[PDB]
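Methods: holo model generation. Sequences were used as deposited, without trimming of termini or removal of tags, and paired with ligand SMILES retrieved from the corresponding compound records. Each pair was processed once, and we did not select among multiple samples. The sequence and fe (iii) ion SMILES for this entry were:
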Amino acid sequence: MKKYTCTVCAYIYNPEDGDPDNGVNPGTDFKDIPDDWVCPLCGVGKDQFEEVEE
Ligand SMILES: [Fe+3]
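and the model returned the structure below.
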């Protein structure tokens, strides 16, 4: 699974860690996060995130 970055603030969503305080368990692929989830740091939506291709 790939890491995704918030292009507004640079937060990184790591699928290994998830975002458990907001209901996103470890092991959740970014595509499967509920589409009303927002960046935990800056509050923007998923449409401002991009795949971290390496
Ligand atoms: Fe952000």
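The first strand starts at residue 4 and ends at 6.
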